[PDB]
């Protein structure tokens, strides 16, 4: 109930919303059916439109008008945005040359530069180039301020998850808005785009920017606008709020446009009908900037122009139907479209079986346009699993396609030529970022970055301390002229031991054997030096990683590699080695095929054993430093140390062996040397975070050897590839991956072919940021470089995506 007979007189677009049943006058009252009877009349005036004309100049104030051209309008804060252009001989903001804003130029009484977030739904990154002729205001913001060629959204690349990620710096799995449509089994409630349930606060986790600001004493405009409030009125409302007295005036504001997404759905991303929506958004930007210039604020406010996701060509005839795969289609509920989420239709049905559902969906048709996953098997870079609202079964849908349950769902629920929601690495899903103002850099291009990073910078712009989030604070310092955040490196928690020779060979009873009993003063001075770390500067290029949790581990040096060996997990946490462009690949000699060697530095009790691998009929083993890349026949024996061994399913060894034998050498060839750091990851509860020992769900049969869920590698070299990886004077270049450690290769439909047709493709799908690996291992990399820490934070957030050129 709302007692809608109160009045909006002097309350139009009030900043604190009043409680029911009193009637509201704020920018969301419409969406709630709760505006006072006179809201339209008083607050949504339209008379005479949005522009001053010659004949209205100096007019007598008529309060009925949408906006004003009377002499008092500047004092009242309610002129039309073009008032000074028409009536006072001023130029439009877009017609002025740009001039560096070295310092904020603000009216007296402004305590900080205000921030205006101008968000545009469905604004695909390539619109900046492709629509440049029709967006002169946007193009000026872009070329005069700071811009990225594109900004990466979060998965799924839908509206609500991305706008709330923008607001919180959180992955959807953490903020809770995991799609545009959701079922929460604990609430037993459903969230939808249409309806009242989405207004309930229990869906919305984390701490959005307006709440962060309010708690710290920074006033915020209300971010959200009812659909029927026209854009011109949203702008006038922001401009009026900016004329409030100092103690009442917000410091942060948001404008939101439903375009170009709304048209892109109907006409496709580049439909000829798309030019007009782009022209119109640009005109709205022009209105804002002209209005700021009127208020003397155009060299005072920081403006962020930011999209939520792009838009792909998608039509009705490109739909896959689950009814073509499953017999039991009525026992499932599907969340359909550009991603698929599957759960049982009834929880009283104990015949429903996910394992058979996935098997029925796996590599069934030669051209299949979706791939099924258990959510914990999705590429870790998507961070899409740790939420009870995310169903166990997920379908990753190919770009340009839909999935639906039955054909009737499509013609009785073509109507659309665009959609989005696909894997956030897809070129068509990328979106835009521009920052313009005193706090942003002048005419500066910055590399692509992820939208999870923005909340931190928005907090920096407003002098706020961010709530805990998934950005890496400092990684976007290069966007800013001032207000940079100066982070310190995390403190190392555990210091390593450096064991020397402490055990005789006969003390080990591991059931291992090696044919290594054939063998100076020359190269035994040498072998001792190597075990003392004489070659460590070659293989450990950026310092040892820091261990940021409490544990017990040893540093082990060798001719060709260095490792941090965990006495708790019985294997390295990391293994570091450098492969120069000149290095050669050799084979494993026949007599060394099954060779495993006790490590006389490490006790039997802290060592793996070969008998466990013999008894475990599912599990085999691999090595972290590859024997194929040994520098000499004698160095090769080090690669067979029991301390370099890790458990591997035979199906996974196909992947790993090909990476080690073929791909590392290929990368060293292409990149002029690479430094490699590899190791295991344990994430049995799929939360993106390093497991403690008591979370491990699987061991090598009969032993305490824990089985990794994933294996990572971080592959670094010189950004200037004219320099070798081990002699690099400047910025670095990195690519990384987190490969799932699976007992089958069902994920790769071509896996019965040669590894040369499918392995590298798998690896690319599981591309990762160094930061993702840090969360998963509790390690901190790049501790000792000659680079600034902010530059290193940027490198750690980099994602190598393997898409071709944006725009093309
Ligand atoms: C991305 O970034 C985010 C943010 O940094 C990372 O996510 C954080 O990660 C932490 C570790 O997993 C986790 O810590 C938890 O916190 C538990 C309490 O959590 C509640 O309170 C949070 C605080 O809100 C307040 O914030 C400020 C202060 O900062 C205050 O001023 C305000 O007043 C706020 O109220 C709150 O954020 C959190 O929200 C979640 O839950 C809500 C509904 O469930 C949702 O609305 C919301 O969306 C959040 O949902 C996510 O997170 C939960 C887990 O919290 C997850 O289940 C969901 O799927 C979803 O992903 C809460 O309301 C605290 O109890 C935990 O401590 C337990 O665990 C350890 C384990 O040993 C012990 O230390 C401890 O003893 C305790 O165990 C006991 O309890 C268990 C019962 O469950 C039991 O098993 C055990 O036996 C014991 O009895 C732990 O510290 C953060 O909550 C989490 N934050 C967020 C926002 O998600 C994320 O990791 C990053 N991702 C990556 C890859 O890096
Ligand atoms: C935020 C959760 C999703 C709500 C989407 N939504 C709608 C529909 C209207 C509207 O006016 N806005 C404005 C914003 C928004 C979100 C984040 C930032 Cl930083 C700034 C503005 N979102 C909406
Ligand atoms: Ca959207
Ligand atoms: Ca075995
Ligand atoms: Ca974990
Ligand atoms: Cl969804
Ligand atoms: Cl296989
Ligand atoms: Cl593109
Ligand atoms: Na949307
Ligand atoms: Zn859309």
Swiss-Prot record:
Regulation: Inhibited by vanadate. Inhibited by micromolar levels of bile salts, such as tauroursodeoxycholate. Not inhibited by taurodeoxycholate. Not inhibited by hydroxysterols, such as 7-hydroxycholesterol, testosterone, dexamethasone and prednisolone. Inhibited by EDTA and EGTA.
Keyword line: Calcium, Chemotaxis, Cleavage on pair of basic residues, Disulfide bond, Glycoprotein, Hydrolase, Lipid degradation, Lipid metabolism, Metal-binding, Obesity, Repeat, Secreted, Signal, Zinc
SMART domains: Endonuclease_NS (SM00892), NUC (SM00477), SO (SM00201)
Annotated binding of 1-(9Z-octadecenoyl)-sn-glycero-3-phosphate, by residue: 159, 180, 261, 420
Outcome of substituting residue 121 to N: Abolishes lysophospholipase D activity
Entry EC number(s): 3.1.4.39, 3.1.4.4
Cofactor field: Zn(2+); Ca(2+)
Protein residues bound to Zn(2+) 2: 261, 265, 420
Pfam family, one: Endonuclease_NS
Binding of Ca(2+), residues: 683, 685, 687, 689, 691
Motif placement: Cell attachment site: 76-78
Protein localization: Secreted
Chain residues that bind Zn(2+) 1: 121, 159, 308-309
Binding annotation for 1-tetradecanoyl-sn-glycerol 3-phosphate: 159, 180, 261, 420
Co-factor binding comment: Binds 2 Zn(2+) ions per subunit. Binds 1 Ca(2+) ion per subunit.
Binding site residues for 1-hexadecanoyl-sn-glycero-3-phosphate: 159, 180, 261, 420
One function term, GO molecular function aspect: phospholipase D activity
Family designation: Belongs to the nucleotide pyrophosphatase/phosphodiesterase family.
Free-text note on domains in this protein's UniProt record: The nuclease-like domain is most probably catalytically inactive as residues that are essential for catalysis in the DNA/RNA non-specific endonucleases are not conserved. However, it is required for the stability of the protein and the catalytic activity born by the Phosphodiesterase domain.
Protein name from the UniProt record: Autotaxin
Organism: Rattus norvegicus
Name of the encoding gene: Enpp2
